[PDB]
Amino acid sequence: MFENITAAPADPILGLADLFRADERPGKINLGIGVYKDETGKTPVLTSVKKAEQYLLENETTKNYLGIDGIPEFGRCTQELLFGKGSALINDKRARTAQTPGGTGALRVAADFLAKNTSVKRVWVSNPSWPNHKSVFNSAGLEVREYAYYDAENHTLDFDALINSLNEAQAGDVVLFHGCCHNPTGIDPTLEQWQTLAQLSVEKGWLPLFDFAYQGFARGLEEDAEGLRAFAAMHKELIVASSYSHNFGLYNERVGACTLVAADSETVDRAFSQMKAAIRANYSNPPAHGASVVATILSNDALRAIWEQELTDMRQRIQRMRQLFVNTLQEKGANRDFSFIIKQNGMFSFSGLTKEQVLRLREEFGVYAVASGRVNVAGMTPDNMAPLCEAIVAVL
Amino acid sequence: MFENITAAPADPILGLADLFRADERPGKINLGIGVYKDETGKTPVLTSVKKAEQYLLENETTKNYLGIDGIPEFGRCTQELLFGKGSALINDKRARTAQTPGGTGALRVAADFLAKNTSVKRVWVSNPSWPNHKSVFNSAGLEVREYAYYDAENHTLDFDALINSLNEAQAGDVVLFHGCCHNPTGIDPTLEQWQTLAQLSVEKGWLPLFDFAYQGFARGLEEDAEGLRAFAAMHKELIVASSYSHNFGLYNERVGACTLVAADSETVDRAFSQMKAAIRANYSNPPAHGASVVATILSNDALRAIWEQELTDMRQRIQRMRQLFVNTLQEKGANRDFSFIIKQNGMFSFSGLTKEQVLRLREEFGVYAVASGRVNVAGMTPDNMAPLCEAIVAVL
Ligand SMILES: Cc1ncc(COP(=O)(O)O)c(CN)c1O
Ligand SMILES: Cc1ncc(COP(=O)(O)O)c(CN)c1O
């Protein structure tokens, strides 16, 4: 049966790690990572998270299955985090949240629900986007189309091209929006541009799908949701796939949510029963540990206070590294203006390097970046900043 | 979109649960549960699991992503549990294991791998089987056909009718086998029958898919894989979906595995890359806590000794209840012969009640069982045994 199964290509983010590990050169730097890293080069367990795990160790009396949709307060809490504490969507019971294995899992559940219960045939993703986007929608049997987004010349959101590619793009098509900290560009719409897109979205009959993987990493917990919130005000229907992998450092516990909103309560319950039937035929019911940690933090005000500070420090570390990257570049002799880096948000940016400059830094120097020129600013430390910058000045 | 989504039909097993917590009238017995309960009626955390979780609290320094296929050690220990300590499959490197979200998640990733990389169009499951088998194979786009299994009259394995229905199965079809503790029947093949089914499988060209959700609950760890191991001896290729939800009490942490064996290592390496591509497009990589707990216990001889003892006592509790149920039925005055309960394995048996006898049992009060007649013997305690048997005698 398996004799003539072909190999499956190297994953563009994952494949680079092996290459790295296996290189065993001295002062090598990996900017191809997809995880926050602190000043010392590591990805620690948050203190709030370790305190909430001690609590669970002492209080759990059973590991009996969660409901198909998970922990209830996990769902109340992510609804307030996404839509704000007094949202009409919450008071009018127009939203339903299922706990899922990570943001990727929420995205696959949304895709299987849409494919099996709806007329959606196509989803529009930005060019560029996180490459596993195309694979979850394609696995569910959905066509993915690309809209323009980025200006390589100016390192900006070329809004006009985005709006023009989103023409025609039929009523009943899904448009996927990154809520904040665009991966791979770090270029986000302004609140005026989000409000325009929201208006255009209801004029055109699109179904907005927000991918929210990085809330809290651009400007703040509430600021980062204004885009979503501008759509949620004008739309009857909406889907949000969020992750708690980054803002809680819970990467391997698979903590995310898939939120469904419909015009009203009765319609969200009918549509959410089919979302649950899609979960049941995939993994049945969700991972409890990671999500229990999130519900314990978010609901205990001491713990939450400490988590918010831990998140603020992760956000400020990335902003320091963005200023220090372009300053050191100007100092070591960089030939080009790289100030756009300071404008961009979260852990990713396109460095503005050629595929051949990205192989030059791997081969010659210790520097590892994704072929696209995407670097992760959290991989830079005040310590490796000068050898990294000398190496890219050398390939400019 | 969503305006006219129809409600999903209530899940047979899970739908009874809410009717149960809505009754709240006094000495209600729920025998429709899918989990082990002890003499208290509780589903405890194993103390071996509490001990391994504290070790993880003290020793984890990161929650950074696992590989797509999960924890290594977890994979090796799963293969020795399944295939035995020195099996040629492990020494020839013919097997590859991916850590998965539960036994249901393993079934779904085997199903997407099979639907996307293979000529399989059908899977044969027994009649009866766990209701969710049809649904995960169907969500992957696979046809499920049914082979005969149970003898309603004699309460046995109708072997002649199973061989016969399986002659309709073509080469390149996957046949699904419950490894031990058949759900809902609890009727398992003898080793002589397993060996028959293996030989016949080799010459007719079936692809074996074993679902092993209860290893250790009928006889013992090794005794329970005896059937798997007869197929593994003569087959080039096979797939095993296993769960650690029941023998470890790790239900809501979603701990299972999917094992691929092929003719040789380079073939299973090429096919396993396609399996990992299917995982990546589903939930990206697996939940760490539960599998970390399984690998810690299995790795350490002290913890593994305590676990084996905890599994022994669960297995002996089910066996005592099977005995005490047919004895109490006898002395409470049952006019049917329930001897067959003693012969069956693990938590489930068909009681041999009609649809209208289980409805009246429930309404005329107390006892909740699946419409099918399926009873979970671990929901019976020495305390509720006589009123339960009272009510069953009352309806024959
Ligand atoms: C845009 C985007 N969406 C979804 C995800 C997935 O999140 P998770 O790690 O929980 O799968 C990522 C990766 N972190 C992402 O960058
Ligand atoms: C036969 C069978 N297979 C698979 C599963 C699923 O196991 P899990 O809960 O780990 O997904 C079950 C349910 N426990 C089952 O009874």
Swiss-Prot record, chains A, B:
Keyword Membrane attributed: no
Reported impact of R374 to F/Y: Second-order rate constants are reduced by >5 orders of magnitude
Cofactor field: pyridoxal 5'-phosphate
Keyword Cytoplasm listed: yes
Expression triggers: Transcription is increased specifically in response to 2,4,6-trinitrotoluene (TNT) and its indicator compounds 1,3-DNB, 2,4-DNT, and 2,6-DNT.
GO BP term (any one): L-phenylalanine biosynthetic process from chorismate via phenylpyruvate
The protein's Enzyme Commission number: 2.6.1.1
Residue positions, PTM N6-(pyridoxal phosphate)lysine: H246
Top-level taxon: Bacteria
Positions annotated to bind L-aspartate: G34, W130, N183, R374
Practical applications: Has been used to construct a 2,4,6-trinitrotoluene (TNT) biosensor strain.
Annotated phenotype, changing Y65 to F/S: Slight changes in activity
Catalytic activity: L-aspartate + 2-oxoglutarate = oxaloacetate + L-glutamate
Single GO MF descriptor: L-tyrosine-2-oxoglutarate transaminase activity
Cell location: Cytoplasm
Oligomeric form and interacting partners: Homodimer.
Name of the protein described by the UniProt record: Aspartate aminotransferase
